[PDB]
A and B are shown apart, each in its own frame.
With several copies, the nearest count.
Chain A
Amino acid sequence: FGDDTDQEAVAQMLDFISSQTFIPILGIHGGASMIMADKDPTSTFFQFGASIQQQATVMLKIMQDYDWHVFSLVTTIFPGYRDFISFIKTTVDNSFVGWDMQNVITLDTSFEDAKTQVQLKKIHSSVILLYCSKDEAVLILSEARSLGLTGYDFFWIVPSLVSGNTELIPKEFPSGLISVSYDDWDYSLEARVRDGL
Chain B
Amino acid sequence: FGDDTDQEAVAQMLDFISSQTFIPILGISGGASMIMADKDPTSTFFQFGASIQQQATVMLKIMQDYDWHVFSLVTTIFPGYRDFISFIKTTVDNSFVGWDMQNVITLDTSFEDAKTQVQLKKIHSSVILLYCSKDEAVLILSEARSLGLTGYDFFWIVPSLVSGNTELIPKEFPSGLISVSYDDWDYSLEARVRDGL
Question: Which residues of A are at the interface with B, using a C-beta cutoff of 8 A?
Answer: 113-115, 117-118, 121, 124, 146-148
Which A residues touch B36, using CB under 8 A? none
Q: A118 touching B151 by the CB < 8 A rule? A: yes
Which A residues touch B117, using CB under 8 A? 146
Q: Write the chain B residue with the least CB distance to A143.
A: B121
Q: A146 touching B121 by the CB < 8 A rule? A: yes
Residue from B118, B121, B122 in contact with A117 in the complex, judged by beta carbons closer than 8 Å: B121
Q: A114 touching B121 by the CB < 8 A rule? A: no
Residue from A118, A124, A146, A148 in contact with B148 in the complex, judged by beta carbons closer than 8 Å: A118
Interchain Cβ contacts under 8 Å between A and B, 21 examples: A113-B146, A113-B147, A113-B148, A114-B146, A114-B147, A114-B148, A115-B148, A117-B121, A117-B147, A117-B148, A118-B148, A118-B151, A121-B124, A124-B124, A146-B117, A146-B118, A146-B121, A147-B121, A148-B118, A148-B121, A148-B122
Q: How large is the interface on B (under 10, 10 to 19, 20 to 34, 35 or more residues)?
A: under 10
Q: Write the chain B residue with the least CB distance to A145.
A: B118
Which A residues touch B151, using CB under 8 A? 118
Which A residues touch B124, using CB under 8 A? 121, 124
Q: Write the chain A residue with the least CB distance to B153.
A: A118
Find residues 4-25 in chain B having any chain A CB closer than 8 Å to their own CB: none
- Given contact pairs A117-B121, A118-B148, A146-B121, a sample of 5 additional A-B residue pairs in the complex whose CB atoms are under 8 Å apart: A113-B146, A114-B147, A117-B148, A146-B117, A148-B122
Which B residues touch A146, using CB under 8 A? 117-118, 121
Q: Write the chain A residue with the least CB distance to B145.
A: A114
Which B residues touch A113, using CB under 8 A? 146-148
CB distance from A150 to the nearest CB of B (A): 12
Q: Mark B65-77, 1 if CB is under 8 A from A, else 0.
A: 0000000000000
Q: Write the chain A residue with the least CB distance to B147.
A: A117
Find residues 111-138 in chain B having any chain A CB closer than 8 Å to their own CB: 117-118, 121-122, 124
Which B residues touch A121, using CB under 8 A? 124
